[PDB]
Amino acid sequence: VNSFSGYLKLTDNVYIKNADIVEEAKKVKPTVVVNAANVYLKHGGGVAGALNKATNNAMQVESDDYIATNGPLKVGGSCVLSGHNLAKHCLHVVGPNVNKGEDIQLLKSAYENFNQHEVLLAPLLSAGIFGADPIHSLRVCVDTVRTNVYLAVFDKNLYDKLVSSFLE
Numbered sequence: 442v443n444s445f446s447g448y449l450k451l452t453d454n455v456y457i458k459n460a461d462i463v464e465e466a467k468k469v470k471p472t473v474v475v476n477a478a479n480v481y482l483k484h485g486g487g488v489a490g491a492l493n494k495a496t497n498n499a500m501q502v503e504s505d506d507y508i509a510t511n512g513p514l515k516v517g518g519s520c521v522l523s524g525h526n527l528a529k530h531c532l533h534v535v536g537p538n539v540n541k542g543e544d545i546q547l548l549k550s551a552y553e554n555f556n557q558h559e560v561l562l563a564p565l566l567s568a569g570i571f572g573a574d575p576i577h578s579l580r581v582c583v584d585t586v587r588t589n590v591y592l593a594v595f596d597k598n599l600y601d602k603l604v605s606s607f608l609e
């Protein structure tokens with residue numbers, strides 16, 4: 442169960458690996474995989490699109506049905522849906538998109554959602570096309586998450602900069 446391999450332990454509860462979150466989810470089948478979602482759960486590209494494609498679009502169909510019944514999420518919020526073939530559950534978390542004018546302070550609220558689950562496989566919230574400084578996103582994760590989080594970062598250059606930044 443939760444057989445994470447090759448991670449570097451940064452703190453008592455935060456681990457990090459240079460890896461594709463989709464490939465990690467297939468190998469580990471964690472209890473929870475985090476999706477870096479938007480408020481309408483439209484998994485159009487990036488991490489969210491890759492996780493959806495690995496479920497052969499079942500995650501998008503389920504997400505559309507969720508939004509029809511419940512309405513959109515809030516920035517900083519989350520919902521629990523099926524993990525399909527990737528995990529027992531998928532925790533869809535909306536980090537702020539600072540390239541769209543959303544407040545970076547909401548990144549603390551976004552990582553707070555992780556605390557309702559004992560173990561999670563997750564990406565670096567608000568990084569990539571969401572525009573946040575990835576070194577800042579790792580600092581907010583370390584300061585906010587109290588449960589056990591395994592971060593998969595699919596870029597060796599960024600992985601090295603994050604580990605060097607943490608060990609300063």
Ligand SMILES: CC(C)[C@H](Nc1ncnc2[nH]c(-c3cnn(C)c3)cc12)c1ccc2c(c1)S(=O)(=O)NCC2
Binds near residue numbers: 463486566567
């Ligand atoms: C900073 C990046 C290195 C990181 N990327 C990733 N981190 C971890 N597992 C990944 N799998 C893939 C993948 C697998 N297949 N395809 C076609 C893509 C990307 C990827 C990342 C972190 C957070 C965010 C993004 C990207 S995003 O721009 O897609 N959306 C905003 C949030």
